[PDB]
Amino acid sequence: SLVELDPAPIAPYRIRNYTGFDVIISTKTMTLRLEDGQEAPWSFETANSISVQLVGSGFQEVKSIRLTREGEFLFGLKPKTQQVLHKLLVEIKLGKDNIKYVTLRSPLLVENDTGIVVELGVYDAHEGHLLKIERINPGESKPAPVGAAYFKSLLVRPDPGFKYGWSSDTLWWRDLLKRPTKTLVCKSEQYGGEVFYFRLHARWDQANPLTRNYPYMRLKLTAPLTIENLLPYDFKYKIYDRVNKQEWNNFLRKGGSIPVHMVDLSHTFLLGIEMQDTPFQASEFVVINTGNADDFKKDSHLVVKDNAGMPLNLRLHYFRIPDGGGSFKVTVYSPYVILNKTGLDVSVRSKGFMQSARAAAGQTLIKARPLMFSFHNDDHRNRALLKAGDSEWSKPQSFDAIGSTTEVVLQTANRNAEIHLGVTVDSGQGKYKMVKVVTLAPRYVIHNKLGEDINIREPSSSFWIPLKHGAHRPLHWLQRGAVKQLCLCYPGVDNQWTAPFNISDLGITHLKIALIRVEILMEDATIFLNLSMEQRNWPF
Amino acid sequence: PYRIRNYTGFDVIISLRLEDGQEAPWSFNSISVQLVGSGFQEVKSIRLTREGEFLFKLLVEIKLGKDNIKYVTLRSPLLVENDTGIVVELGVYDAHEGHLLKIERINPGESKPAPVGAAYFKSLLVRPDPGFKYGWSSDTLWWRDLLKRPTKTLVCKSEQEVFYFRLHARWDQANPLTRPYMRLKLTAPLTIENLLPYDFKYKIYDRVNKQEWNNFLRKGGSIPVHMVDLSHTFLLGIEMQDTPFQASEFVVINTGNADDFKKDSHLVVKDNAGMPLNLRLHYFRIPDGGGSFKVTVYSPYVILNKTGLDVSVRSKRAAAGQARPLMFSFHNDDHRNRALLKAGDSEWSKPQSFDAIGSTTEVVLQTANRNAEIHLGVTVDSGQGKYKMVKVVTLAPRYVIHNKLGEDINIREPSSSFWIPLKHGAHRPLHWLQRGAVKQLCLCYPGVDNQWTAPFNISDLGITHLKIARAGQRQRLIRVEILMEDATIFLNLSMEQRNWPFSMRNESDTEFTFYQVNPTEDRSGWRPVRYRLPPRSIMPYAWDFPAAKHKEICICAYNKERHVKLQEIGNLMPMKLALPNGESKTIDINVTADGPTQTLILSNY
C-alpha cells in the first residue's frame, strides 16, 4: 500500500543588475559576478548584508547593504568628482512568491506602461550622439545607467519595426523638475503626417531634497488614449482629430480594451462607433477630448439610432490613468442590458415621469439577443413596461433597484390565463459594475427526472401539456388564484391524475402516482420544480 | 352507499320503516315511499341515481357528499337554513287560533324543513335557544308575504335586551311551483373580524335603540353580533391592548334607512403622542343573506422587524406607534407613496416600495461618520389565507452566519482588522460590512498565534470548502453552506465529515512538492503554501484558496514544475525529470474520478 499522511503543510533572494556596469556582489566569502542586465538568485548559506562593486565604473565598493527590509535605499558612491555624489539605488520588493527581488540601479527609472516594446536611448545632446539603447518590455521599467543619469539626456522611441523615430525632444531631469508632464512626439519614417505619441509623466517625492540635486524620479510612459468596449456587442470605431483632420479606423471586441497612440491631448478629438450584428446605425461623432484652444465640454453620452430611427443613449465613462499626467481611458457602455430569458418574445417600452411611453430602440424577435436599453433622460422616476407574447402591458417596473427580484404578473389577451415572470436587476460582475443587468425569466420552471415522459395539468383546468424525460420547460400561462397548483399523470390512457400540490411552497413534497418526490426551490426570481422518483423509505 | 333522512313530519315506509326525524342507511335502482297517516297515496318510481332537488308537494333532495354517499332527504319544499352560530328553534304556528303545533330544533350549519302539507297552510316562527331567554319572533314567517317581501329583520324580545335575526327567502324565479318552494336563510346581522396583529376590545353604539355593547376580540378571530338591527345606523369603536395606541373614535359601519351617514372605509387610531394610523375596514355582504354583512378591521401594512437592530420607518411623516410587529399606513392611497428605513446609526434609505407584492430587495445603508454599511433584505408579500388584503413587509439582515463547528470561532472581513467572535451554536447577523462589490469572510480559532483562513465569497450560493488549522496542528476542512432564504443569505459553518475533494496519490519513487498556482485584482488572498508528497504516499487536499477563478495545482520535482488541473480526467502527459546522477526519469500523471473525490495519480513510466 501507500503511506497515508495528514494534510498539514511544510534561494530567498533574487538580485538583478541594472546599473549599466558589471558588478561583483560579496557577502561580508561567497561572491557572485553579474553582467549588465542579468539576474541570479542569492542566499546567505555582517548578518544578512552584501557588498556591491561596480566593475569598470571608477567607483568604490559599497559596503553594508542590508537586504532584509524592503523599499528604495540610496547609497553614496564615494569618489565625488565635483560635489557630484553619485548614488546607487537598491530597490527591494517582497513579491507574492515570498522572494525578495533586489534591483541595483540608478535613481532615475523609466516605466513602460504601454502595450509595446519601447527603446530607451542615452543621448549626448551637446555631441548629438546616442551612447547606449536598452529595450523595455510592456509593463516593465528600466533605468538610466549609473552616473550617466546625472549628465546625459534620455530619448524614447517605439520598437524599430514600427518605423517611428526617436522623440524630437529629450528627457532631461533638470527640465522635468520644472515641467514633469510632456507629450513625446515621434515622426514616422514612411509618412510625414503619421506621428506616434507617447505621454510622459515624471513623479518623485517632494519632501526628499535629493531630487533637487540628483535625478531621483520615476518617468512613466503611457498611451494618451485607451478605448474600452463594455457593450455586449463588438464595434468598429473611428477616431477623428479636428486639428489637421485625420481619421483612424479600427475594430474592438466586447470586453476588450485598446490603446491609441495616434492623437495628441492638445487637440480636440472625437469618437464614432458602428456596432456590428445589431439593428443600429453608425453613431455620430461625440467629443471625447477637448483641446487647449477649444472649450467643448466632453460628451458624457453617445447616441446610436436604429434602422427605424429610435435612439439609444450609451454612456461614456472617463478614468484618468493614475500617475499618468493626463492620459485617460474612455469606456463606452450601455446603462441597461436586458436579457430575455423567458422563451416568449418580449417587448420593452420606456415611460418617463411626465413623458409618455415610447418603444425601446433596436428590439428584435427571438435565441434571444441581449437588448441594450437606455431612458430618454437620467431621471430616477423613469420606469419601463414589459409585454410577453399576447399579454397586456405591465405595471411600471424599476430597473434601478440594484439586487432586486420582483414577481410580474401579466394579464393576457382574450382569455383568463396570466403569465408569471421573475425580474432580477443586478450590477454586472467585475468591470461591468456600471452596467445594470436586467434578467427577465419565467417564475415557474418544471424539470422532469422521473425516467419517462409525464403529463402535467393545473387542476382547475382541462388543458394538459406533456413533458419529456430530462427536459426543462416553463409554466407561463396559469389560471387565476391565490395558490397555484399542478397534477401529474402517465401518458397511458385510463391512468389517473394525482392529488394537487402547491407549486409555490418551497421544500420537498411527496406525491403518489399509479412515490414521486417534488422539490421546489427558488433561484434568482425563478421557482424551479424538480420531479424525481423517491428512492428512500416512505414517511408513513 | 345510500342514506335516507326522513324529515317529512310523518313516519315513512321505504321499499325500511323510518320514523320522523331519523336517518337510516340504504342500498340496492328506484324505491317507493309511503307517508303513514298522511292521507296521500304511495309515491313510487323514485330514482336515486342523480343528485338535485326532485318534486313529487313532496321534495326529495339528493346530495353526493364528501364520503361519496347518496344523502336523500325527504321533506316539504319549505326549508329553513340556520347559518348562525347558535341553536335555533322553529315553531309551526296556526295564526288563526294562536296555536303552536310543533317545535323542531335546528343546529348551527344545518337546516330543517316545515312539515309536509302544513307548509302551505300554517305559518312559521323562529326563536333562539331557550337558555338565552329570548321569546319568539314578533311577526310571523308566512311564505305568501315572503313572495312579495323576501327580506326581513326578525325581532325577539327578552323574557327579562333584544335579539335580532336577518331572514332572506330565495327561490328559482323560473320555477312553476311559485305561489311554497323557497329557502329561508337565517343569518346574524353583523359579524366583526379581527385581522390586526393585536387583539382589541370593541364597543358597538347605535343612534336608535340607544344600546352600547362591549366585547373582546382576539387576533384572527371572528364574532357574530345579534344585538343590532340593520335598519339602525350603528357604529364601531376599537381599542387595542398591548399597543402604544389609545382608543379609537367611532366610525360608521352601518347606515340606516332614514339616515344618510356614509359607511366608513377607514378607522383612525391615535397613539399616546398624537400620530395617526389609518386601519382599513373591509365589508363583505353575506350571499343570500338579505344584506347582512361582515366587517373586517385590518392593517394595510404590517412591518416585521427581524433585523436585531432598532429600526425607524418614515412615510413619504414618521410612523405611528414605533420585536413586536409594527402596524403601518400611509396618509393617503397613492401608489407613488414610498417609505424610508433607518437601522441603528445609519442614514435614511432610498425610497422603498411597500406595494411591490412578492419582491425581495437589498437595501444598503451608509452609516454615520464611518465607512461601514448596513445591508438589509426587504421582503414584501401578501398575507396567507384570510390575511390576503394585508401587505407584509419583512425587514431582515442580508447576511446571517451560523456556527455548527463544535468550537467557538472568530470571523473577519479580509479588508478589515476588526474581528467578531462567534460562539458555538449561535446565529449572528452580519450587519456592518466594508464597501466593495465582493463581500468576503475569514475564520480563525480564538487565541493568538493562530492563522486566518483564505477569504471566501459570502454572496456565492452553494457549498464551499475551507481549510483551517490551529498552531502546530493538522488541517481540518470546514463545509460552508451558503443559501438564500428570502432576502437573507444564511452561511452555515460545519466540520466536513466526508472525504476531501482531492487525494494526491504518489505511486512513484520520486518526492514531489505541490502548491496552488497564483491566479495573478484578485481577492483569493494567495500566499505560498507548499506541501511535501514523499514517494509512495497519499494525502487528501482541499483548495488552499477557494476564492480563485482559475484553480490549478503545480507539482515540483528536481527544479521542474508542472501545472495540472484537478477536475478534468487528464491526458497522461508525462513529466521528464533530470536527476543529479545523470539519468532521466519519466512520471506519468493521471486524474481519476472516485465519486465526489478527484484522485491525482503520479506513477513511474
Residue numbers in the entry:
A (entry chain A): 3 to 12, 20 to 37, 53 to 69, 84 to 404, 413 to 560, 568 to 593
B (entry chain B): 21 to 35, 56 to 68, 86 to 113, 125 to 228, 232 to 250, 253 to 389, 396 to 401, 414 to 611, ...
Tell me what the authors wrote about this structure, in their words.
Here we present the crystal structure, at 3.0-Å resolution, of the VAB from the fungus Chaetomium thermophilum, complexed to the Pro-X-Pro motif of Mcp1p from the same organism. Although we were unsuccessful in crystallizing the VAB domain by itself, we did obtain crystals of a construct comprising the VAB of C. thermophilum Vps13p (residues 1,944–2,635) N-terminally fused to the Pro-X-Pro-motif of Mcp1 (residues 15–32), PXP(Mcp1ct)-VABct. The VAB comprises six modules of the same topology arranged end to end to resemble a fishhook. There are two VAB molecules in each asymmetric unit. In the second copy, PXP-VAB1–5, we modeled only the first five repeated modules (residues 1,944–2,516), as the electron density for the sixth repeat was poor, most likely because this repeat is flexibly positioned with respect to the rest of the protein. There is strong density for the Pro-X-Pro-motif fused to the N-terminus of PXP-VAB1–5 (L17V18E19L20D21P22A23P24I25A26E27), showing that it interacts in trans with PXP-VAB1–6, binding on the acidic face of the VAB at the conserved interface between its fifth and sixth repeats. Residues L17-D21 form a short β-strand alongside and parallel to the fourth β-strand of the sixth repeat module, with the two conserved hydrophobic residues (L17 and L20) packed against hydrophobic surfaces. The two proline side chains (P22 and P24) are buried in a groove that runs along the interface. A prominent patch on the surface of the sixth module and extending to the interface between the fifth and sixth modules is highly conserved across fungi, indicating functional importance. Further, mutation of an asparagine residue at the C-terminal end of the first β-strand of the sixth repeat module of the VAB (N2521 in C. thermophilum Vps13p) abolished Pro-X-Pro binding.
VPS13 family proteins are thought to mediate directional bulk glycerolipid transfer between organelles at contact sites, where organelles are closely apposed, effecting membrane expansion and organelle biogenesis. In yeast, Vps13p localizes to multiple contact sites in part via the so-called VPS13 adaptor binding domain (VAB), near the C-terminal end. The VAB, with no significant sequence similarity to any previously characterized protein domain, interacts with a Proline-X-Proline (Pro-X-Pro) motif present in receptor proteins at contact sites. Receptor proteins include the sorting nexin Ypt35p on the endosome, Spo71p on the prospore membrane, and a multipass integral membrane protein, Mcp1p, in the outer mitochondrial membrane.
